[PDB]
A paper describes a structure:
B-cell activating factor (BAFF; also known as BLyS, zTNF4, TNFSF13B, THANK, and TALL-1) is a member of TNFSF and a crucial factor for survival and maturation of B cells. BAFF is expressed as a homotrimeric transmembrane protein that can be released as a soluble homotrimeric cytokine after cleavage at a furin protease site. In 2011, the FDA approved belimumab (Benlysta), a fully human monoclonal IgG1λ antibody neutralizing soluble BAFF, as the first targeted therapy for SLE in the past 50 years since the introduction of corticosteroids and immunosuppressive therapy. Here we report the 2.05 Å resolution structure of the BAFF–belimumab Fab complex and 1.90 Å resolution structure of belimumab Fab alone for elucidating the molecular mechanism of this antibody drug against BAFF.
Author numbering:
A (entry chain H): 2 to 136, 144 to 224
B (entry chain L): 3 to 211
The structure:
């Protein structure tokens, strides 16, 4: 039983966002789906939950009036809509399963989805520029420059290459835009012969770009 | 409301205890979540000392009055994380979380930063921009500063530098970016990124040559 969540979003203050949580097995059965958020660098806060089998939901009073959770038991999908958005709603939003109350009185929240980053900002969206960082071992990388908002993801060779990869936390520039880099450490003997490609994804700008990184 | 100590330390291989307190714990059992940087929380203990599948038996829980405790024996570097307690509220309607406890596992070796400095790419120069990229990783403890030089002269303008962030191996990462015109980049003999860590300096240089 795994939970899959919709992708990162950006919304302007005053608007609304809908975030999805999908059950891998196609069904929620008996269970509740809970929504828990985490503002950057802060703790966890429960927002509400639903039992899709009956559609019954309860909400944190911190949000009552601008949160609504619904579900489609037929597609095993649950959605949380947060409206009248404010900057302080910028957070990663998780879904997490709880089991039936009376049958599992002492159980908790598990499993958790991977989280959905939602940024609430009136600043303009900006897709990144991607540049190759050309190379015992050698380091090579990709520069992901001047974008907004978070997040960006980087994979290497379409995810085939994971060992030796380090994707750094973004810098928030004084300009208000972000930049990050991803580097992989590889055997220098491989530089002539092995193709290395970074795959950069920035959902808010609908950016999906590959860059081959060659020796100069 | 649930309260926890903001932080607790433990020596490598030893036993650490994280406490949780609140009136709702009179009604329900606390549950405990482990969260590492950039990751979703993971349930480790619930109910009367129950462990979910795949959680090692080094983790255990107990409860008493309006308190609960998470105990980790034989602490490993890998146990370093934030630990949250949670429970149903006294009403039994909603969920409440404690503020989290930052667990530090001590005894980690001093480690110098690995520094990698990249010059501007051909592609970026062609687009009439120039960014030097200084990438700093695997240092401990997590305190560095970064500075730049043109030839042997300090350069403070056009610099954007992160504060250190904890890596998954409990060492730290940081980065710095220096923006130049192509003309500036071409003008000097070299540029340097200089990283200061624990009274030591790591300087890497690049040259348009």
């Amino acid at each position: 039983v795994q939970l899959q969540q919709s992708g990162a979003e950006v919304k302007k203050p005053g608007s609304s966002v809908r975030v999805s949580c999908k059950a891998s097995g196609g069904t929620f059965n008996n269970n509740a789906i809970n929504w828990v958020r985490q503002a950057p660098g802060q703790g966890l806060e429960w927002m509400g939950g639903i039992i899709p089998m009956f559609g019954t939901a309860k909400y944190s009073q911190n949000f009552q009036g601008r949160v609504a959770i619904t579900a489609d038991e037929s597609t095993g999908t649950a959605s949380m809509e947060l409206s009248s958005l404010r900057s302080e709603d910028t957070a990663v939003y998780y879904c997490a399963r709880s089991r039936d109350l009376l049958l599992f009185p002492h159980h908790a929240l598990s499993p958790w989805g991977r989280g959905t980053m939602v940024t609430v900002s009136s600043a303009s969206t900006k897709g990144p520029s991607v540049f190759p960082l050309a190379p015992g071992t050698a380091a090579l990388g990709c520069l992901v420059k001047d974008y907004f908002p978070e997040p960006v993801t980087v994979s290497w060779n379409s995810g085939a290459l994971t060992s030796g990869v380090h994707t750094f936390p973004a810098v928030l520039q004084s300009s208000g835009l972000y930049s990050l880099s991803s580097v992989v450490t590889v055997p220098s003997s491989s530089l002539g012969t092995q193709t290395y490609i970074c795959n950069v994804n920035h959902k808010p700008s609908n950016t999906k770009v590959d860059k081959k990184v060659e020796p100069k | 409301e649930l309260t926890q100590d903001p932080a607790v330390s433990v020596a490598l291989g030893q036993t650490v205890r994280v406490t949780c307190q609140g009136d709702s714990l009179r009604s329900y059992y606390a549950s405990w979540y482990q969260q590492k940087p950039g990751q979703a929380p993971v349930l480790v203990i619930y109910g009367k000392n129950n462990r979910p599948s795949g959680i090692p038996d080094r983790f255990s829980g107990s409860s008493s009055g309006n308190t609960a405790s998470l105990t980790i024996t034989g602490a490993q570097a890998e146990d370093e994380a934030d630990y949250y307690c949670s429970s149903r509220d006294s009403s039994g309607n909603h969920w409440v979380f404690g503020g989290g406890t930052e667990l530090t596992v001590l005894g980690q070796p001093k480690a110098a930063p690995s520094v990698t400095l990249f010059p501007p790419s051909s592609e970026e120069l062609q687009a009439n921009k120039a960014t030097l990229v200084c990438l700093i990783s695997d240092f401990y403890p997590g305190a560095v500063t970064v500075a730049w030089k043109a030839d042997s002269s300090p350069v403070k303008a056009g610099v954007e530098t992160t504060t250190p962030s904890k890596q998954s191996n409990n060492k730290y990462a940081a980065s710095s970016y220096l923006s130049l015109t192509p003309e500036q980049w071409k003008s000097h003999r070299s540029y340097s990124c200089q990283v200061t860590h624990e009274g030591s300096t790591v300087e890497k240089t690049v040259a348009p040559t």
